[PDB]
Design a binder for this molecule. Structure first.
Ligand SMILES: [Mg+2]
Ligand SMILES: [Mg+2]
Ligand SMILES: [Mg+2]
Ligand SMILES: [Mg+2]
Ligand SMILES: [Mg+2]
Ligand SMILES: [Mg+2]
Ligand SMILES: [Mg+2]
Ligand SMILES: [Mg+2]
Ligand SMILES: [Mg+2]
Ligand SMILES: [Mg+2]
Ligand SMILES: [Mg+2]
Ligand SMILES: [Mg+2]
Ligand SMILES: [Mg+2]
Ligand SMILES: [Mg+2]
Ligand SMILES: [Mg+2]
Ligand SMILES: [Mg+2]
Ligand SMILES: [Mg+2]
Ligand SMILES: [Mg+2]
Ligand SMILES: [Mg+2]
Ligand SMILES: [Mg+2]
Ligand SMILES: [Mg+2]
Ligand SMILES: [Mg+2]
Ligand SMILES: [Mg+2]
Ligand SMILES: [Mg+2]
Ligand SMILES: [Mg+2]
Ligand SMILES: [Mg+2]
Ligand SMILES: [Mg+2]
Ligand SMILES: [Mg+2]
Ligand SMILES: [Mg+2]
Ligand SMILES: [Mg+2]
Ligand SMILES: [Mg+2]
Ligand SMILES: [Mg+2]
Ligand SMILES: [Mg+2]
Ligand SMILES: [Mg+2]
Ligand SMILES: [Mg+2]
Ligand SMILES: [Mg+2]
Ligand SMILES: [Mg+2]
Ligand SMILES: [Mg+2]
Ligand SMILES: [Mg+2]
Ligand SMILES: [Mg+2]
Ligand SMILES: [Mg+2]
Ligand SMILES: [Mg+2]
Ligand SMILES: [Mg+2]
Ligand SMILES: [Mg+2]
Ligand SMILES: [Mg+2]
Ligand SMILES: [Mg+2]
Ligand SMILES: [Mg+2]
Ligand SMILES: [Mg+2]
Ligand SMILES: [Mg+2]
Ligand SMILES: [Mg+2]
Ligand SMILES: [Mg+2]
Ligand SMILES: [Mg+2]
Ligand SMILES: [Mg+2]
Ligand SMILES: [Mg+2]
Ligand SMILES: [Mg+2]
Ligand SMILES: [Mg+2]
Ligand SMILES: [Mg+2]
Ligand SMILES: [Mg+2]
Ligand SMILES: [Mg+2]
Ligand SMILES: [Mg+2]
Ligand SMILES: [Mg+2]
Ligand SMILES: [Mg+2]
Ligand SMILES: [Mg+2]
Ligand SMILES: [Mg+2]
Ligand SMILES: [Mg+2]
Ligand SMILES: [Mg+2]
Ligand SMILES: [Mg+2]
Ligand SMILES: [Mg+2]
Ligand SMILES: [Mg+2]
Ligand SMILES: [Mg+2]
Ligand SMILES: [Mg+2]
Ligand SMILES: [Mg+2]
Ligand SMILES: [Mg+2]
Ligand SMILES: [Mg+2]
Ligand SMILES: [Mg+2]
Ligand SMILES: [Mg+2]
Ligand SMILES: [Mg+2]
Ligand SMILES: [Mg+2]
Ligand SMILES: [Mg+2]
Ligand SMILES: [Mg+2]
Ligand SMILES: [Mg+2]
Ligand SMILES: [Mg+2]
Ligand SMILES: [Mg+2]
Ligand SMILES: [Mg+2]
Ligand SMILES: [Mg+2]
Ligand SMILES: [Mg+2]
Ligand SMILES: [Mg+2]
Ligand SMILES: [Mg+2]
Ligand SMILES: [Mg+2]
Ligand SMILES: [Mg+2]
Ligand SMILES: [Mg+2]
Ligand SMILES: [Mg+2]
Ligand SMILES: [Mg+2]
Ligand SMILES: [Mg+2]
Ligand SMILES: [Mg+2]
Ligand SMILES: [Mg+2]
Ligand SMILES: [Mg+2]
Ligand SMILES: [Mg+2]
Ligand SMILES: [Mg+2]
Ligand SMILES: [Mg+2]
Ligand SMILES: [Mg+2]
Ligand SMILES: [Mg+2]
Ligand SMILES: [Mg+2]
Ligand SMILES: [Mg+2]
Ligand SMILES: [Mg+2]
Ligand SMILES: [Mg+2]
Ligand SMILES: [Mg+2]
Ligand SMILES: [Mg+2]
Ligand SMILES: [Mg+2]
Ligand SMILES: [Mg+2]
Ligand SMILES: [Mg+2]
Ligand SMILES: [Mg+2]
Ligand SMILES: [Mg+2]
Ligand SMILES: [Mg+2]
Ligand SMILES: [Mg+2]
Ligand SMILES: [Mg+2]
Ligand SMILES: [Mg+2]
Ligand SMILES: [Mg+2]
Ligand SMILES: [Mg+2]
Ligand SMILES: [Mg+2]
Ligand SMILES: [Mg+2]
Ligand SMILES: [Mg+2]
Ligand SMILES: [Mg+2]
Ligand SMILES: [Mg+2]
Ligand SMILES: [Mg+2]
Ligand SMILES: [Mg+2]
Ligand SMILES: [Mg+2]
Ligand SMILES: [Mg+2]
Ligand SMILES: [Mg+2]
Ligand SMILES: [Mg+2]
Ligand SMILES: [Mg+2]
Ligand SMILES: [Mg+2]
Ligand SMILES: [Mg+2]
Ligand SMILES: [Mg+2]
Ligand SMILES: [Mg+2]
Ligand SMILES: [Mg+2]
Ligand SMILES: [Mg+2]
Ligand SMILES: [Mg+2]
Ligand SMILES: [Mg+2]
Ligand SMILES: [Mg+2]
Ligand SMILES: [Mg+2]
Ligand SMILES: [Mg+2]
Ligand SMILES: [Mg+2]
Ligand SMILES: [Mg+2]
Ligand SMILES: [Mg+2]
Ligand SMILES: [Mg+2]
Ligand SMILES: [Mg+2]
Ligand SMILES: [Mg+2]
Ligand SMILES: [Mg+2]
Ligand SMILES: [Mg+2]
Ligand SMILES: [Mg+2]
Ligand SMILES: [Mg+2]
Ligand SMILES: [Mg+2]
Ligand SMILES: [Mg+2]
Ligand SMILES: [Mg+2]
Ligand SMILES: [Mg+2]
Ligand SMILES: [Mg+2]
Ligand SMILES: [Mg+2]
Ligand SMILES: [Mg+2]
Ligand SMILES: [Mg+2]
Ligand SMILES: [Mg+2]
Ligand SMILES: [Mg+2]
Ligand SMILES: [Mg+2]
Ligand SMILES: [Mg+2]
Ligand SMILES: [Mg+2]
Ligand SMILES: [Mg+2]
Ligand SMILES: [Mg+2]
Ligand SMILES: [Mg+2]
Ligand SMILES: [Mg+2]
Ligand SMILES: [Mg+2]
Ligand SMILES: [Mg+2]
Ligand SMILES: [Mg+2]
Ligand SMILES: [Mg+2]
Ligand SMILES: [Mg+2]
Ligand SMILES: [Mg+2]
Ligand SMILES: [Mg+2]
Ligand SMILES: [Mg+2]
Ligand SMILES: [Mg+2]
Ligand SMILES: [Mg+2]
Ligand SMILES: [Mg+2]
Ligand SMILES: [Mg+2]
Ligand SMILES: [Mg+2]
Ligand SMILES: [Mg+2]
Ligand SMILES: [Mg+2]
Ligand SMILES: [Mg+2]
Ligand SMILES: [Mg+2]
Ligand SMILES: [Mg+2]
Ligand SMILES: [Mg+2]
Ligand SMILES: [Mg+2]
Ligand SMILES: [Mg+2]
Ligand SMILES: [Mg+2]
Ligand SMILES: [Mg+2]
Ligand SMILES: [Mg+2]
Ligand SMILES: [Mg+2]
Ligand SMILES: [Mg+2]
Ligand SMILES: [Mg+2]
Ligand SMILES: [Mg+2]
Ligand SMILES: [Mg+2]
Ligand SMILES: [Mg+2]
Ligand SMILES: [Mg+2]
Ligand SMILES: [Mg+2]
Ligand SMILES: [Mg+2]
Ligand SMILES: [Mg+2]
Ligand SMILES: [Mg+2]
Ligand SMILES: [Mg+2]
Ligand SMILES: [Mg+2]
Ligand SMILES: [Mg+2]
Ligand SMILES: [Mg+2]
Ligand SMILES: [Mg+2]
Ligand SMILES: [Mg+2]
Length: 51
RNA sequence: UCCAUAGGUGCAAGAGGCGAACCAGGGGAACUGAAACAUCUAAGUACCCUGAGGAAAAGAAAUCAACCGAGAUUCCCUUA
RNA sequence: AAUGGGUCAGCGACUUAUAUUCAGUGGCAAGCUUAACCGUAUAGGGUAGGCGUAGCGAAAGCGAGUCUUAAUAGGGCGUU
RNA sequence: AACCCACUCCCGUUGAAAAGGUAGGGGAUGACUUGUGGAUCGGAGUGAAAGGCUAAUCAAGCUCGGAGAUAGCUGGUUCUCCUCGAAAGCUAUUUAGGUAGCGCCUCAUGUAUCACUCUGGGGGGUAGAGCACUGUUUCGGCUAGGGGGUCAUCCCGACUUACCAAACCGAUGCAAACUCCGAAUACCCAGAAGUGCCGAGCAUGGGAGACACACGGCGGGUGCUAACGUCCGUCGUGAAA
RNA sequence: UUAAAAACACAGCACUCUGCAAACACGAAAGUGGACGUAUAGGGUGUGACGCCUGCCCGGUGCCGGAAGGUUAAUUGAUGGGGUUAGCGCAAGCGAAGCUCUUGAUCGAAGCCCCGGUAAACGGCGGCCGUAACUAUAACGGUCCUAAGGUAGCGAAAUUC
RNA sequence: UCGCUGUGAAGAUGCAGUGUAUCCGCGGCUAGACGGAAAGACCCCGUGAACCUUUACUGUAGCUUUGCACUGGACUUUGAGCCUGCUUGUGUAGGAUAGGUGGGAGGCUUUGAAGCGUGGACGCCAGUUCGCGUGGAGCCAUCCUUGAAAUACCACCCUGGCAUGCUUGAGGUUCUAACUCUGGUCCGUAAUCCGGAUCGAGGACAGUGUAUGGUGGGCAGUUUGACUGGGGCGGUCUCCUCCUAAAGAGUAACGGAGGAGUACGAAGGUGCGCUCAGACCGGUCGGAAAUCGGUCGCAGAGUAUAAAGGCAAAAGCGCGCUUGACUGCGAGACAGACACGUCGAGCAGGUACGAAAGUAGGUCUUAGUGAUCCGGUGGUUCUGUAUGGAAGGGCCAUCGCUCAACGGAUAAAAGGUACUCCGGGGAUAACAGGCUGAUACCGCCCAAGAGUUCAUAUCGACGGCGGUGUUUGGCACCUCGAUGUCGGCUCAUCACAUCCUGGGGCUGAAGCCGGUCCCAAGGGUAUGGCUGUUCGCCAUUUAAAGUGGUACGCGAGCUGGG
RNA sequence: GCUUGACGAUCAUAGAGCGUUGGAACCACCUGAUCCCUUCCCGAACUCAGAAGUGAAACGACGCAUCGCCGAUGGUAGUGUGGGGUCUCCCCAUGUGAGAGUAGGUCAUCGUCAAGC
């Protein structure tokens, strides 16, 4: 079943998004551009551990 | 058991028992509430026991405050 | 053909204390009111305290504003 | 026999008696019966064991205290007149005979809306109807084809379809979970006349009760279109006339 | 004080515990019974004169013995990570010694896991296929499972619908 | 203070209609007053109670393990630490030997006694250390070659292992002086208690305090859901779709049918482009069904996942680019007890596609879910108990429940009661009454057929229509502050759907006997064996051994076998 | 008013099917694939440069009711209110009133703009 993950900003802020994924099917990480509220720009977010 | 100790007799002085409550201690429930019930509550209450007094207890900061200060203990009204 | 009462006389069930809210009726009025306690004792004193005159925010705080927010934009609450 | 016991019948049952009597019955030198004095007791004693007995009380004695334990459960609640007037529903609940918010009653304050009819706008998929879809029914015609055989062809060509037959054409029925169609009524909305007991609507506060409903008509499920059956919707009456 | 019996006891039988300050029981304890007894004794448990007998299963749950290994308490405190501040630094920030907050290496018995016994310990003791000179039935063969598949006796029974 | 028949909270002295009847005792009998007595004991309910059980939960007495204390000496085995000489340092490599660093570049202390080696050895073994066997004797040649740095030389630490030292974990043995003795003899003393003394035995064990693991129904406080055509057993309990549902919304049943407790980094956004299923004809192995060509067809396909409502600007299909599955909000609504829920134009920041107008705050829509408390993680213009910090708290983001009994009592919980008890209920079962009549029983309609032929003498298949309250049931209206339930005895009373006796028609009625139907209720209508039996089966009778109602008549009339 | 193109209004009385007809202009077919651009292959489609040919295909216009689609009048079914019966179903008074079918209609009717008369 899908497991929760965190998406941490590449900037120095501590902002993060949250979602889930299928680890068995797609085993690589996710690199997706999102808006960072603290710096008010679109930056790249990287997968991390929910726990 | 040598010493002297336990022990044994004689004198004096005191205590012992009773009392409704109050006071300082020792021991210490459950029903009940939680709309069930174990933590919790009821409650350190009921009850039992021991001492004292006309009262008792506590009392003269190894205390509080907050950089300004207060000045032993007890009781009342607020802070609440 | 469900309950209660053989009858009479007497007795027998919404109380009291303390904290409060609303209404009626009064005293003062941007102020109102004292508690313990003194007392010439139902008087008078005692205004420590309580409520009101300003709100918003979790708070620091700022204030007819304030909070949220990058935002004197929008919106919540408040102000004649 | 005495003495200890208690198997049977009857009487008695407001008794002579809160366990007896008459007539029969068992043991009767023993694990016997009995007097006096003594010991063990309340989660404790004693018991050749029946949960028996512990002062006519025992699956935990009596007495006084905690104590007016607690009781969503029964019962009861005392003088008079006037105005108004319910509910037995929805939601949640270790909830279902309790309670809480909302709906329904009453009182106060404020404020401007309401009801009935006429006219004008609006959506619908019910009753009915139908077969255009999805299922289901019958008749006839027309047929691919399976094949009923077929001269029996070593086994392949066929003579024909004497059985069955998709599909198509026409006729003809049915449907809560079918629809090419489709009302009445009921619901929203607006504009108007009058009536309203002088108000109807709405908002905010004080006080509730109630959340076991019953039958009758109409529309339904369930049942046997059985029940003074039962479970909904909508009216009327009883409740409370 | 509605049940006198098939219920309880019983003599006999068996298992098990106990070496004496006994096991065991009543007692916060002192002590007392057991017992002024001593394994031919004392306690508990079941069965219930006598006769003939008392079959199979140690997988479960108890009890008994074993000690190699695994897991394992309080206790102890290696290691790592923080807080404070003499100092250094323009600053940001680094920071010795003390004190202090967490972390948790190592040490550690019984028990449990393991190995083996024990049923007059608590308990348990099966199915399906073929097969005989008529039929029928299977002495006989396969096969599944189990710790093992009920023996001797008795049986429409105080048990049988 | 009458009977009957109806009615009626459904079994009436009291109501309706009607019939009977002067007023009042005494002796008797018990059919009724749902007669008296005991707030039903059966049954259900109460977030009632007792007592009992156990591998329910949570604990506990007792028993047992180990640490510390009371609690000491010696010897020995042994792990760890520590001190000293540290002599040990044998690799590719070098005559020979590598852990390195500074003084140091040759050693001249009996030279550095010399070639092998003697006594002892170790040795990645043939190398090195220790008196040259004689004795006061020229060997290591200092990069002499090689080796990553040549020894000689003063110092800085350890390494394979030894000796001792002061400590230290465990093990065994012993000693006596702590402790213990429910062992002897002396004294207090006139004493099987108790002390003190002294002998004997055990002995740092036992035992007790405190801390800790195990065991522990021996004992204790409790828990063990609700709905429900009575309870129990079974089933269900949250969410989505359709019907019921009566053409706005909503609407119940243990009513009729199905699904959910997910999926997807593309299955999302955008630009561009394109249409299906199926049928027929033609065409290599396939042949009804592969891929190819053509015509028809238009949605009979598809849509991640049930069903319903939708789908041409396709919401279906493919390709390029991509992250709007964005952050702060939010006019206004829909739903609604609350807590929750649903839709959304527009504004501000930053984006993505597209030439651009523009589109994008996930997916065609409606299921895919769980409050608060508590604890964890990342930030932070907050707070931080004298002060500066810090701990802890607040705010923002996020994680942990099949709390499925799904608004979730607690972090933590099963049973028995026939030994039972209290408060209640005809709000709710068992007996009898009531309503109903599926079923039961009794009639009738049709007539295939059986009856040698012949439908109806006697029967009668497949089907149909009634009657009675009479069986098994359905319901739950009366009674739980009590209406005694099977069978037997005693005593009855009524109906007729007649068993005998009486009167008739038909007959497949010769007679004697019968069969069937019609009329008729006056009177009659067995005894026994077995069983608690009513029934039933047997034996022997009789003219015959009727069927039913009456609280399945009758316990204030008896019994007590069930 | 006449013909052809673009965009609309309206969504079958406007559609389908059959027959006839249109190249002056427009439109369509057409030639080639150098150049922009394109095919998961192909200039088939998209695109570019015009122009020799034709109205065949397509499209438009005009005819026909064969199919489709519209469709009365009258009657019938249902139904709100009030009242009756023999009451599982109906009837009466009053208001309302389908679906199906029958007679019959239909080969559409309009607006803006630009090219030729
Ligand atoms: Mg003396
Ligand atoms: Mg005194
Ligand atoms: Mg006194
Ligand atoms: Mg005290
Ligand atoms: Mg005291
Ligand atoms: Mg105390
Ligand atoms: Mg309690
Ligand atoms: Mg309670
Ligand atoms: Mg309570
Ligand atoms: Mg309770
Ligand atoms: Mg509790
Ligand atoms: Mg507990
Ligand atoms: Mg307490
Ligand atoms: Mg006290
Ligand atoms: Mg005194
Ligand atoms: Mg004094
Ligand atoms: Mg005194
Ligand atoms: Mg005095
Ligand atoms: Mg004084
Ligand atoms: Mg004093
Ligand atoms: Mg003093
Ligand atoms: Mg000072
Ligand atoms: Mg002083
Ligand atoms: Mg009466
Ligand atoms: Mg009664
Ligand atoms: Mg009465
Ligand atoms: Mg009652
Ligand atoms: Mg009475
Ligand atoms: Mg009085
Ligand atoms: Mg007032
Ligand atoms: Mg005033
Ligand atoms: Mg504002
Ligand atoms: Mg405002
Ligand atoms: Mg006796
Ligand atoms: Mg006699
Ligand atoms: Mg006698
Ligand atoms: Mg005797
Ligand atoms: Mg004798
Ligand atoms: Mg004797
Ligand atoms: Mg005897
Ligand atoms: Mg005697
Ligand atoms: Mg005595
Ligand atoms: Mg006594
Ligand atoms: Mg007791
Ligand atoms: Mg006892
Ligand atoms: Mg007993
Ligand atoms: Mg007893
Ligand atoms: Mg018993
Ligand atoms: Mg007494
Ligand atoms: Mg007694
Ligand atoms: Mg008790
Ligand atoms: Mg109390
Ligand atoms: Mg009381
Ligand atoms: Mg009660
Ligand atoms: Mg209740
Ligand atoms: Mg009552
Ligand atoms: Mg009462
Ligand atoms: Mg009125
Ligand atoms: Mg209720
Ligand atoms: Mg009630
Ligand atoms: Mg309520
Ligand atoms: Mg219909
Ligand atoms: Mg029809
Ligand atoms: Mg059809
Ligand atoms: Mg329909
Ligand atoms: Mg309607
Ligand atoms: Mg008036
Ligand atoms: Mg009100
Ligand atoms: Mg209700
Ligand atoms: Mg009521
Ligand atoms: Mg109702
Ligand atoms: Mg009801
Ligand atoms: Mg009703
Ligand atoms: Mg009805
Ligand atoms: Mg009904
Ligand atoms: Mg009915
Ligand atoms: Mg009813
Ligand atoms: Mg009704
Ligand atoms: Mg009414
Ligand atoms: Mg009336
Ligand atoms: Mg009336
Ligand atoms: Mg009422
Ligand atoms: Mg009336
Ligand atoms: Mg009324
Ligand atoms: Mg007896
Ligand atoms: Mg006897
Ligand atoms: Mg007896
Ligand atoms: Mg007995
Ligand atoms: Mg003993
Ligand atoms: Mg023995
Ligand atoms: Mg014994
Ligand atoms: Mg026995
Ligand atoms: Mg026996
Ligand atoms: Mg016996
Ligand atoms: Mg026996
Ligand atoms: Mg075993
Ligand atoms: Mg074994
Ligand atoms: Mg062992
Ligand atoms: Mg610091
Ligand atoms: Mg620092
Ligand atoms: Mg430090
Ligand atoms: Mg260890
Ligand atoms: Mg061990
Ligand atoms: Mg054995
Ligand atoms: Mg046995
Ligand atoms: Mg045998
Ligand atoms: Mg037998
Ligand atoms: Mg048996
Ligand atoms: Mg009568
Ligand atoms: Mg009557
Ligand atoms: Mg009468
Ligand atoms: Mg009367
Ligand atoms: Mg009358
Ligand atoms: Mg009357
Ligand atoms: Mg008389
Ligand atoms: Mg009599
Ligand atoms: Mg009588
Ligand atoms: Mg009676
Ligand atoms: Mg009675
Ligand atoms: Mg009572
Ligand atoms: Mg009762
Ligand atoms: Mg409960
Ligand atoms: Mg309850
Ligand atoms: Mg118990
Ligand atoms: Mg337990
Ligand atoms: Mg313990
Ligand atoms: Mg210890
Ligand atoms: Mg002893
Ligand atoms: Mg020891
Ligand atoms: Mg020990
Ligand atoms: Mg201990
Ligand atoms: Mg127990
Ligand atoms: Mg117990
Ligand atoms: Mg217990
Ligand atoms: Mg309790
Ligand atoms: Mg309980
Ligand atoms: Mg519970
Ligand atoms: Mg229940
Ligand atoms: Mg049931
Ligand atoms: Mg019901
Ligand atoms: Mg029922
Ligand atoms: Mg029901
Ligand atoms: Mg019922
Ligand atoms: Mg509706
Ligand atoms: Mg409706
Ligand atoms: Mg609805
Ligand atoms: Mg309802
Ligand atoms: Mg999609
Ligand atoms: Mg669909
Ligand atoms: Mg794409
Ligand atoms: Mg995205
Ligand atoms: Mg938007
Ligand atoms: Mg934007
Ligand atoms: Mg762009
Ligand atoms: Mg909690
Ligand atoms: Mg501080
Ligand atoms: Mg912090
Ligand atoms: Mg629940
Ligand atoms: Mg719930
Ligand atoms: Mg719910
Ligand atoms: Mg809900
Ligand atoms: Mg609770
Ligand atoms: Mg219980
Ligand atoms: Mg009772
Ligand atoms: Mg009661
Ligand atoms: Mg009832
Ligand atoms: Mg009920
Ligand atoms: Mg019955
Ligand atoms: Mg009866
Ligand atoms: Mg009955
Ligand atoms: Mg009945
Ligand atoms: Mg009944
Ligand atoms: Mg015949
Ligand atoms: Mg005949
Ligand atoms: Mg009857
Ligand atoms: Mg009946
Ligand atoms: Mg009933
Ligand atoms: Mg009921
Ligand atoms: Mg009912
Ligand atoms: Mg009755
Ligand atoms: Mg009853
Ligand atoms: Mg009564
Ligand atoms: Mg009669
Ligand atoms: Mg007759
Ligand atoms: Mg007869
Ligand atoms: Mg005859
Ligand atoms: Mg007959
Ligand atoms: Mg007769
Ligand atoms: Mg007769
Ligand atoms: Mg007669
Ligand atoms: Mg007669
Ligand atoms: Mg006569
Ligand atoms: Mg007889
Ligand atoms: Mg018999
Ligand atoms: Mg005869
Ligand atoms: Mg009779
Ligand atoms: Mg009877
Ligand atoms: Mg009878
Ligand atoms: Mg009797
Ligand atoms: Mg009887
Ligand atoms: Mg009697
Ligand atoms: Mg009677
Ligand atoms: Mg009677
Ligand atoms: Mg009698
Ligand atoms: Mg009996
Ligand atoms: Mg018409
Ligand atoms: Mg009507
Ligand atoms: Mg009409
Ligand atoms: Mg028409
Ligand atoms: Mg039509």
């Amino acid at each position: 079943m899908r497991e929760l993950i965190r998406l941490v900003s590449s900037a120095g802020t501590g902002h993060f998004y949250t979602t889930d994924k299928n680890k068995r099917t797609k085993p690589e990480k996710i690199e997706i551009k999102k808006y960072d509220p603290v710096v008010r720009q679109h930056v790249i977010y990287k997968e991390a551990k929910i726990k």
